[PDB]
Amino acid sequence: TDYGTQLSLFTHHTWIGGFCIVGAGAHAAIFMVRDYDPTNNYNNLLDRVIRHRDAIISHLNWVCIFLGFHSFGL
Amino acid sequence: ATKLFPKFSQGLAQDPTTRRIWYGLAMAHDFESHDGMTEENLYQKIFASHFGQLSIIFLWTSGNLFHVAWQGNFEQWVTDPVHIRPIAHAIWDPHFGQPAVEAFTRGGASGPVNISTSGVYQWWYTIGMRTNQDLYVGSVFLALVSAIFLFAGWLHLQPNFQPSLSWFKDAESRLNHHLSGLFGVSSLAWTGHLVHVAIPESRGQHVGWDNFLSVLPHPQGLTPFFTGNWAAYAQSPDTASHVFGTAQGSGQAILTFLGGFHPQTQSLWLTDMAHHHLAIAVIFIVAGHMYRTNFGIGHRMQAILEAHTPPSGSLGAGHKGLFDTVNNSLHFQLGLALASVGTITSLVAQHMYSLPPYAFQAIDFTTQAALYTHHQYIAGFIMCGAFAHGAIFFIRDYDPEQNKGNVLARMLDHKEALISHLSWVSLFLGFHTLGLYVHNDVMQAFGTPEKQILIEPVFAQWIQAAHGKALYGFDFLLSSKTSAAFANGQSLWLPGWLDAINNNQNSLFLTIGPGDFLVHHAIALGLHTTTLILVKGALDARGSKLMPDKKDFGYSFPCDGPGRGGTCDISAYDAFYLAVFWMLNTIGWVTFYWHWKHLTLWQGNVAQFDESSTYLMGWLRDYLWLNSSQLINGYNPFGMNSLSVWAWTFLFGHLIYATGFMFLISWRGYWQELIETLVWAHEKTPLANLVYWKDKPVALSIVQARLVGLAHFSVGYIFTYAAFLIASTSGRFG
Amino acid sequence: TSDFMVHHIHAFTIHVTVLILLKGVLFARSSRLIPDKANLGFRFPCDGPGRGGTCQVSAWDHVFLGLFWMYNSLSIVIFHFSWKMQSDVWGTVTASGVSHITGGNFAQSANTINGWLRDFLWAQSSQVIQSYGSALSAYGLIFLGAHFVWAFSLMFLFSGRGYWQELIESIVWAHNKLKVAPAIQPRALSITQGRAVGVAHYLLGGIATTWSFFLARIISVG
Amino acid sequence: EVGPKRGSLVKILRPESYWFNQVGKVVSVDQSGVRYPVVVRFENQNYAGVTTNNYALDEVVAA
Amino acid sequence: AHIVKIYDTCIGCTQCVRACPLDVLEMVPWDGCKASQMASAPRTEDCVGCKRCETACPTDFLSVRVYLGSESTRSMGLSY
Amino acid sequence: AHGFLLAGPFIKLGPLRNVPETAEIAGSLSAAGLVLILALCLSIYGSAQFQST
Amino acid sequence: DIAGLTPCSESKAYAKLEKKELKTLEKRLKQYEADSAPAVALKATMERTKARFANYAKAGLLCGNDGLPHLIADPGLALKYGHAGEVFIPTFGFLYVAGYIGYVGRQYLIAVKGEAKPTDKEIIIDVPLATKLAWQGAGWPLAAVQELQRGTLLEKEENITVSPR
Numbered sequence A: 001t002d003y004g005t006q007l008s009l010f011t012h013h014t015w016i017g018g019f020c021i022v023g024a025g026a027h028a029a030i031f032m033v034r035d036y037d038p039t040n041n042y043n044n045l046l047d048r049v050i051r052h053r054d055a056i057i058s059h060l061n062w063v064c065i066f067l068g069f070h071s072f073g074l
Numbered sequence B: 001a002t003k004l005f006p007k008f009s010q011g012l013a014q015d016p017t018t019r020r021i022w023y024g025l026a027m028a029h030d031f032e033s034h035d036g037m038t039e040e041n042l043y044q045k046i047f048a049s050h051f052g053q054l055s056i057i058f059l060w061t062s063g064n065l066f067h068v069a070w071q072g073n074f075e076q077w078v079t080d081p082v083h084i085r086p087i088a089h090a091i092w093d094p095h096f097g098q099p100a101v102e103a104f105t106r107g108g109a110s111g112p113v114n115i116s117t118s119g120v121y122q123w124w125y126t127i128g129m130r131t132n133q134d135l136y137v138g139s140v141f142l143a144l145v146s147a148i149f150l151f152a153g154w155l156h157l158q159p160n161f162q163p164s165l166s167w168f169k170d171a172e173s174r175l176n177h178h179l180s181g182l183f184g185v186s187s188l189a190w191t192g193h194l195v196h197v198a199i200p201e202s203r204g205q206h207v208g209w210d211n212f213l214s215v216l217p218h219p220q221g222l223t224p225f226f227t228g229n230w231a232a233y234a235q236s237p238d239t240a241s242h243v244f245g246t247a248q249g250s251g252q253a254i255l256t257f258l259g260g261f262h263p264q265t266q267s268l269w270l271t272d273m274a275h276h277h278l279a280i281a282v283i284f285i286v287a288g289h290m291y292r293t294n295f296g297i298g299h300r301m302q303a304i305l306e307a308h309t310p311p312s313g314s315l316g317a318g319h320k321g322l323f324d325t326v327n328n329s330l331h332f333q334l335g336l337a338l339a340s341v342g343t344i345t346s347l348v349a350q351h352m353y354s355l356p357p358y359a360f361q362a363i364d365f366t367t368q369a370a371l372y373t374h375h376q377y378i379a380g381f382i383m384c385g386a387f388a389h390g391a392i393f394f395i396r397d398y399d400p401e402q403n404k405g406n407v408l409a410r411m412l413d414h415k416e417a418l419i420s421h422l423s424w425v426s427l428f429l430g431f432h433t434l435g436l437y438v439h440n441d442v443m444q445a446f447g448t449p450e451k452q453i454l455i456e457p458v459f460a461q462w463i464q465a466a467h468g469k470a471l472y473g474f475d476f477l478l479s480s481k482t483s484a485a486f487a488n489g490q491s492l493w494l495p496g497w498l499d500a501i502n503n504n505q506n507s508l509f510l511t512i513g514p515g516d517f518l519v520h521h522a523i524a525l526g527l528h529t530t531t532l533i534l535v536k537g538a539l540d541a542r543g544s545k546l547m548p549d550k551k552d553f554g555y556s557f558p559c560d561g562p563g564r565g566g567t568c569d570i571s572a573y574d575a576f577y578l579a580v581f582w583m584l585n586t587i588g589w590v591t592f593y594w595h596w597k598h599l600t601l602w603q604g605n606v607a608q609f610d611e612s613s614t615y616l617m618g619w620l621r622d623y624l625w626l627n628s629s630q631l632i633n634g635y636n637p638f639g640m641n642s643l644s645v646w647a648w649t650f651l652f653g654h655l656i657y658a659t660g661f662m663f664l665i666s667w668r669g670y671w672q673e674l675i676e677t678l679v680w681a682h683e684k685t686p687l688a689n690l691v692y693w694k695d696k697p698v699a700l701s702i703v704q705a706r707l708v709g710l711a712h713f714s715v716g717y718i719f720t721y722a723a724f725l726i727a728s729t730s731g732r733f734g
Numbered sequence C: 001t002s003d004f005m006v007h008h009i010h011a012f013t014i015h016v017t018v019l020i021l022l023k024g025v026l027f028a029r030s031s032r033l034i035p036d037k038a039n040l041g042f043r044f045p046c047d048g049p050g051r052g053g054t055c056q057v058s059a060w061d062h063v064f065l066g067l068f069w070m071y072n073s074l075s076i077v078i079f080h081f082s083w084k085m086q087s088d089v090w091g092t093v094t095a096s097g098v099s100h101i102t103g104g105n106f107a108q109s110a111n112t113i114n115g116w117l118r119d120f121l122w123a124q125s126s127q128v129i130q131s132y133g134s135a136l137s138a139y140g141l142i143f144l145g146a147h148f149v150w151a152f153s154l155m156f157l158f159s160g161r162g163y164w165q166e167l168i169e170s171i172v173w174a175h176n177k178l179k180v181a182p183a184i185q186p187r188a189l190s191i192t193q194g195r196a197v198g199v200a201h202y203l204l205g206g207i208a209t210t211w212s213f214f215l216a217r218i219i220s221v222g
Numbered sequence D: 001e002v003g004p005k006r007g008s009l010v011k012i013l014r015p016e017s018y019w020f021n022q023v024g025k026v027v028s029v030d031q032s033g034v035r036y037p038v039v040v041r042f043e044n045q046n047y048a049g050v051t052t053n054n055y056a057l058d059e060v061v062a063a
Numbered sequence E: 001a002h003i004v005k006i007y008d009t010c011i012g013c014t015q016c017v018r019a020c021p022l023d024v025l026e027m028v029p030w031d032g033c034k035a036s037q038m039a040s041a042p043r044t045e046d047c048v049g050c051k052r053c054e055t056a057c058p059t060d061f062l063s064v065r066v067y068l069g070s071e072s073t074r075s076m077g078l079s080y
Numbered sequence F: 001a002h003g004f005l006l007a008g009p010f011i012k013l014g015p016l017r018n019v020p021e022t023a024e025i026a027g028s029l030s031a032a033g034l035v036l037i038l039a040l041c042l043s044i045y046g047s048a049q050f051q052s053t
Numbered sequence G: 001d002i003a004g005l006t007p008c009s010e011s012k013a014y015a016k017l018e019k020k021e022l023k024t025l026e027k028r029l030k031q032y033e034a035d036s037a038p039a040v041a042l043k044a045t046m047e048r049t050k051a052r053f054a055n056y057a058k059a060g061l062l063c064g065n066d067g068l069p070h071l072i073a074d075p076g077l078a079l080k081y082g083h084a085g086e087v088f089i090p091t092f093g094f095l096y097v098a099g100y101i102g103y104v105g106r107q108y109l110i111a112v113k114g115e116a117k118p119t120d121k122e123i124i125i126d127v128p129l130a131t132k133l134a135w136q137g138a139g140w141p142l143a144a145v146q147e148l149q150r151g152t153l154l155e156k157e158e159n160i161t162v163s164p165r
């Protein structure tokens, strides 16, 4: 029954979650750049993800556009 | 492949990308850099293009006349114009629903018409139209004239009538004809129309193409003109008990000098406008005989430029050798033309809100708002163009050895002083203006509104007392009854001006106070800043210290890469690119300010302005928030009314604007990689790898996306503000 | 139905942010555009204007654009929560049924953008704009400052460092005239730093605005 | 022979140089048929982070 | 194709060649500097204009320039 | 195939979908219009794609 | 008077605003006790408020139609009608202190350029030298006009100008 507390707590934790997830993206990228050595990592889940990144990103692009048109055009 | 489009640039019609389409649309009017372009060919293409532009202008005006005459109600509007609204044109949209058309049908019409917030009705009622038939005749005439200009434009390209190069670059013979003919004779003929038609239509008569040859404009007629009794054309002018479209209190004069306004119509008298066009017709025709043509007595412009170098050498060579750069270059002349036309446009706006010329203007308020806002924004764009072509002049057409020691090289010698001092004034105005506004905000937010700085603008009030506004208790030069100027002008042209300047209901010399102080400083900040960006872009176009051979790249080049710390946005094009934002901001300030001051004037409480204009929350709450109540209620789950289209345009603007941010914030290469994965996807998809691109898809280039983002920013900005202004002012008073 | 539509809005923005970040991760070492993007490192501005123009190809800039989209998605989420709660949950039990704070207008208005702009942003800002003189004016005064910082970010986002380098050079001349040349040298910000400062101010201004608005509203009427 | 001696302070006159109209210190003057024999150091750096440059005979002045 | 020009202030330090990711620069004998070398651009049809040659040049205002020009399918770096 | 599938959504979701017995007519006519425009697109694609070797 | 206003002493709007502020303040005051620190702070606010109104009435300020003070920025006008203490004296005060700060800074810069590493003494302040120069310039304008009249204030044209012209 303290409305301001409810709104503030939900909003605050929402924002902190968002920032942390973006940070996850950034440091995964930093591992991709610096500490990745392909000699110890030959045929592998990470290797195969890198090896069909084009299919991955193309389909993610498609579904983004589909949701865009429908969800906002409504 | 080596495709046809476009034929002007061979290197452009070579690459297998989609860059050729956009660039072919972009370099079409860059005549100076096509293939095989000589100089004669350049001038001839420019000439024919001018004819094209004239054709389009006259055709457009014919269109306005035709639609007003056919779908409007100009025949009914002239009986009572403080009443039934103007009608622009009628709508036939198959997308409408029942309450939509039931709503839009307004102004006495029979279908979906929309109101004409353009001021054409007042113009055509003042100049002497009265019925539809005259408007149709005008439309047919202007369409015919447009066809004539189009044909002439085709004519002067045909190889027997192509003017040679030296027919152009003839300064002295073009100015005599322009100044005498184009200005003077046109002004004299317009005086003819005012005297013969517009005045007797304002007395009550139908002087048409029939029987204008048999009607005396003045009941004496060309006797006093050839005797030298000219003041007999001014005896017994129109009484102040006048009714405009009838003969009630009608006078007989045709050339007076009264000043002031019309007492019943709130416009300038027609006789004063006749006299004015007559006088400046004489002045321009006399001024048209200055220069030399195939005769004796004329001047030479080169001699005049040569002899004006001051002794003691405070200027090096003075104006030596300028005449061979004004004459030889086009971007210089275009820069001067845009500068003059932009300043004159501003002057048009500034005089037409305060001294309204047209009958029953300033009782249609939406007309005032749209006209003034329109001309202000036009002036802004024109001035920005002037400085842009200054920069193009420096890069393409400047020659140092021809300009060794004139003022043009002096300006390049000490440019750091210019940029420094423009930077200084911009900083000073910024700090103090923003500081005073923030201080007033803090004082208003806490419970104490008397603890805030409210400087009284005593200079402009001194000037307003100098013009005759007898309210500030200064008593000098026109407000004092024993001055020389007051007593000399008293007998004929003052008493109208004093009654028009002491009225607190017209727009002439509004009462001012501290809010006006603060806003005028904000405006000065806008002008100095925009001048800083543009002048810096122009003068640093030959080269900088970050790059001392910028002249080898041309006007609009992307960057110089990551080296030397990276040089994004280094071209002069990008300097102008940054300046456009400031232009939009500054005109935003002047137009917000004008609009709110006149809203509080037309509603009735100037106190609300003089109190809430001194702190930014006053603007946000009392202008943007309060006045957008009837706008966004243009449609709701309960219904809709007239201003639904505006309430849709109002969101449309935002959408364009926000899309504008995308091309600005997110630069290119990301999109290049995304488009490449798209290429893979369409290449390997079964049943859709049967359709290919003919020209390979690529992302937009670095220079282009700046232009596109700026286009979205400007278009969304303009549509949003136009929607708010029209909807708010016409929702309250309309 | 309004819930259906807003939920798919949430799904849309989440997928877009996933697109940007995952694309940054996968194209961090190399791509068809740059075959040796690994040797340029994690944080680098470009690879010149060549091959069309290669601004923002590092994974770092993918993080940058991801920050913008995170802002967008979460703004929508918290707007959804605020209006849904004020329209369908909270309110007083006046022993005459339930009278909510905003009367229960979510199901009829959350399908038009005009609905959001009017009923949410324009209707619910009456307390944050009229808080002057009361014990709540700090919010109505930090509102405007948040706007100011938001609009201040745009200079850093839109423009570029060559222009500022030249302007700073001219002011350095104006100091060389008066013998106040700083012996450390004034240089404009690097490209990456200009972008980063831009996004910092952007997020600060936007989030501060939302903070002020929420707290003034719900502390005033809640 | 050909140039000013090392340790001396010179003043640059080549305009496109970043150190135009400023003061540098000479390191060595090449005696061969090189087109630019004078090696000048500077106490500050240009935009690229370099503090040393060659110059021609007539573009430096002993000052 | 772009325009790559080598100027005479070159000292022949081979930095531009090791920075070119497309092998359009090469060192030719020359008798104008201490190193007795000078860069040259015999293959500017393969250049894409990335401007790493400009970044690698030590001598102030540079001894190598890359003027941008009419793009082709090789100067855009298109792999598809 | 494509015409028969394209007719449907105009019938069920077009602006003439509640007025009985004429909701089918407007949908079918609009679908025929769309097919017409697709034919035009095919023709100009033929004019642009196979225009060379 | 001065551009159509009246001094705040007989200004009707002035007393109305004063009464309004006292009214809201007493309204806040009513619901507490007579010994509580809330009431202590509220009465302190009353005292400061009424003292502020008296101080603004005493200084001969000028109020428009809103009852708010207006400042006059004009040397002849303010010096003639007794208003030198609202723009004129403040501007000379500010110019004094601002030129003081600038002059002290400039003297520091010249004082540290003459060393072996000018950058270290810029990043790490020489505190004895900085305090010394912080005192030594309380009379700056005299030293400023001397540096001007001797021609050492301005560098000559050995400044680096952009190349080319």
Ligand code: CLA
Binding pocket: A019, A020, A021, A022, A023, A024, A026, A030, C042, C043, C060, C063, C200
């Ligand atoms: C557990 C959390 C965590 C940890 C340990 C790290 C740790 C690191 N990150 Mg990282 N990051 C995180 C979360 C985290 N991050 C999140 C949530 C994001 C998304 C925003 C990022 C985004 C990110 C990027 C994009 C980069 C890093 C980088 C780095 C490395 C260098 C950091 C550095 O030098 O900062 C120095 C400290 C600062 C710059 C402080 C400035 C921060 C801002 C400007 C202040 C915030 C303003 C404040 C809230 C309000 C202002 C108050 C008042 C002044 C007005 C380091 C390993 C960098 C790298 O290269 O790694 C090798 C890099 O490029 N991170």
Ligand code: CLA
Binding pocket: A061, A064, A065, A067, A068, A069, A072, A073, B655, B658, B659, B660, B661, B662, B665, B666, C016, C019, C020, C065, C068, C069
């Ligand atoms: C409101 C402004 C705006 C809009 C509309 C978009 C739109 C888009 N951005 Mg975006 N962006 C913006 C601002 C905006 N951005 C800003 C400010 C930034 C900086 C941070 C970015 C950064 C950014 C990145 C980094 C990415 C996007 C992506 C996208 C795309 C997502 C797919 C989608 O929804 O398309 C659908 C299109 C719409 C929803 C637009 C409205 C369409 C209407 C409703 C219907 C269209 C039919 C039309 C009326 C018919 C035309 C008729 C006419 C010819 C007569 C889309 C094109 C992503 C992308 O492309 O991958 C998917 C992506 O990677 N943008």
Ligand code: CLA
Binding pocket: B046, B047, B050, B051, B054, B168, B170, B173, B174, B175, B177, B178, B181, B182, B183, B344
């Ligand atoms: C008397 C003879 C004469 C006349 C009438 C003209 C007239 C014209 N010449 Mg021209 N010309 C002449 C002799 C003449 N010239 C000679 C002898 C030469 C050889 C030296 C040239 C060489 C020449 C060239 C090379 C070019 C022209 C061009 C033009 C046109 C200018 C564009 C325009 O419409 O401006 C209209 C301008 C005005 C009406 C005056 C504006 C005055 C102020 C600024 C406006 C405000 C007044 C008022 C408030 C407006 C009322 C608004 C109303 C709606 C309420 C114009 C038709 C140009 C052109 O368009 O080519 C087709 C062009 O390129 N001429």
Ligand code: CLA
Binding pocket: B025, B026, B027, B028, B029, B030, B031, B338, B381, B382, B383, B384, B385, B386, B388, B392, B555, B556, B573, B576, B711, B715
């Ligand atoms: C007297 C008028 C005039 C004339 C004759 C010229 C003539 C010229 N200008 Mg210029 N200019 C003008 C006014 C003028 N300008 C003004 C007012 C500005 C300020 C905005 C500029 C700014 C400007 C720049 C910055 C540049 C020029 C350039 C040029 C040259 C090439 C033009 C070209 O290729 O464009 C081709 C034209 C187009 C591709 C049209 C683009 C369409 C624009 C973006 C408007 C789109 C808005 C859209 C219609 C809105 C629709 C709304 C929707 C809802 C319906 C040419 C000599 C260029 C030049 O010399 O290159 C070196 C150049 O760089 N001018």
Ligand code: CLA
Binding pocket: B423, B424, B426, B427, B428, B429, B430, B431, B434, B529, B532, B533, B578, B579, B581, C148, C149, C150, C151, C152, C153, C154, C155, C156, C158, C159, C167
């Ligand atoms: C909110 C938006 C905003 C603001 C405030 C400014 C402000 C400024 N711009 Mg502009 N600009 C903007 C948007 C904005 N711009 C946008 C969107 C663009 C398009 C890219 C540009 C493009 C642009 C260009 C191209 C140029 C400017 C210039 C300027 C300066 C003009 C001089 C002036 O007014 O000094 C007043 C300065 C201020 C009000 C700055 C605020 C200083 C604050 C009040 C002090 C700090 C307070 C406090 C200590 C902070 C504590 C926090 C702590 C954590 C540090 C000034 C810094 C010009 C310039 O620099 O000329 C000299 C210039 O060349 N701007």
Ligand code: CLA
Binding pocket: A069, A070, A072, A073, A074, B095, F009, F010, F013, F014, F015, F016
């Ligand atoms: C993108 C979102 C979106 C959606 C879903 C709709 C949907 C609709 N609009 Mg609409 N509209 C939108 C955006 C949208 N609008 C926007 C942005 C605008 C403003 C520009 C409008 C403006 C507008 C107007 C002005 C009108 C509509 C109307 C309509 C209705 C009929 C349209 C019609 O005949 O469709 C034609 C149908 C098709 C093209 C069907 C194609 C889709 C097929 C079925 C996809 C199948 C994919 C399948 C799963 C693939 C499987 C492959 C497998 C077999 C191998 C329909 C409910 C009309 C109406 O009366 O509404 C009731 C109407 O008058 N709209």
Ligand code: CLA
Binding pocket: B094, B095, F010, F014, F015, F016, F026, F027, F029, F030, F031, F032, F033, F034, F036
């Ligand atoms: C100024 C341009 C313009 C015009 C005149 C129209 C006109 C129309 N639009 Mg439209 N529209 C436009 C631009 C325009 N649009 C744009 C730019 C967009 C995108 C934003 C749309 C999007 C849009 C949608 C989404 C829809 C319309 C629809 C309609 C129709 C509504 C009338 C009605 O109530 O349905 C009555 C409709 C009919 C009676 C059907 C007539 C079908 C055509 C006209 C006849 C074809 C004849 C036949 C095929 C020829 C035989 C060929 C032979 C080989 C057999 C009408 C024909 C609606 C529509 O027609 O779709 C169902 C609709 O749903 N519009």
Ligand code: CLA
Binding pocket: B458, B459, B462, G074, G075, G076, G077, G080
């Ligand atoms: C920023 C420019 C500026 C402007 C617009 C004004 C405006 C004004 N000053 Mg003023 N003034 C200024 C700067 C300015 N001051 C400065 C910097 C000084 C200090 C040197 C003065 C010193 C001053 C005195 C001593 C007097 C005024 C007076 C006046 C008023 C009438 C005289 C006038 O306008 O002369 C035109 C002003 C200028 C062109 C600007 C240059 C400033 C000169 C030096 C002031 C001229 C004073 C004038 C000759 C006195 C006329 C006496 C009057 C009875 C006719 C008028 C309100 C008179 C007054 O009280 O009016 C009632 C008066 O007696 N001023």
Ligand SMILES: CC1=C(/C=C/C(C)=C/C=C/C(C)=C/C=C/C=C(C)/C=C/C=C(C)/C=C/C2=C(C)CCCC2(C)C)C(C)(C)CCC1
Binding pocket: B331, B332, B334, B335, B336, B339, B343, B386, B387, B389, B390, B391, B393, B538
């Ligand atoms: C960049 C460039 C350029 C351009 C520039 C510009 C754009 C400029 C502008 C300018 C301007 C835009 C200016 C303005 C001016 C104005 C003025 C100068 C004004 C004056 C006024 C007066 C003088 C007035 C007076 C009076 C009064 C006060 C009131 C009463 C009446 C009388 C008349 C007495 C060019 C092309 C050249 C080329 C080079 C480069």
Ligand SMILES: CC1=C(C/C=C(\C)CCC[C@H](C)CCC[C@H](C)CCCC(C)C)C(=O)c2ccccc2C1=O
Binding pocket: B662, B663, B664, B666, B667, B668, B671, B672, B675, B698, B699, B700, B701, B702, B705
């Ligand atoms: C979206 C985007 C792209 C991708 C844009 C593409 C691929 C083009 C999108 C346009 C589509 C193909 C058509 C748009 C529809 C318009 C109505 C077309 C108008 C054409 C005129 C001739 C009327 C960039 O290449 C880019 C480059 C640099 C900075 C920012 C951006 C950027 O934001």
Ligand SMILES: CC1=C(C/C=C(\C)CCC[C@H](C)CCC[C@H](C)CCCC(C)C)C(=O)c2ccccc2C1=O
Binding pocket: C155, C156, C157, C159, C160, C161, C164, C187, C188, C189, C190, C191, C194, C195
């Ligand atoms: C304004 C601007 C600059 C110029 C901004 C600069 C130089 C930052 C200046 C910050 C402060 C004012 C300088 C540091 C002040 C020192 C700490 C001096 C002490 C001051 C005392 C008051 C503490 C860029 O360098 C830039 C680069 C890339 C894209 C956009 C931009 C950009 O928009």
Ligand code: SF4
Binding pocket: B558, B559, B560, B561, B562, B566, B567, B568, B569, B702, C045, C046, C047, C048, C049, C053, C054, C055, C056, C191
């Ligand atoms: S514009 Fe792009 S390519 Fe050029 S320097 Fe800037 S980031 Fe790099």
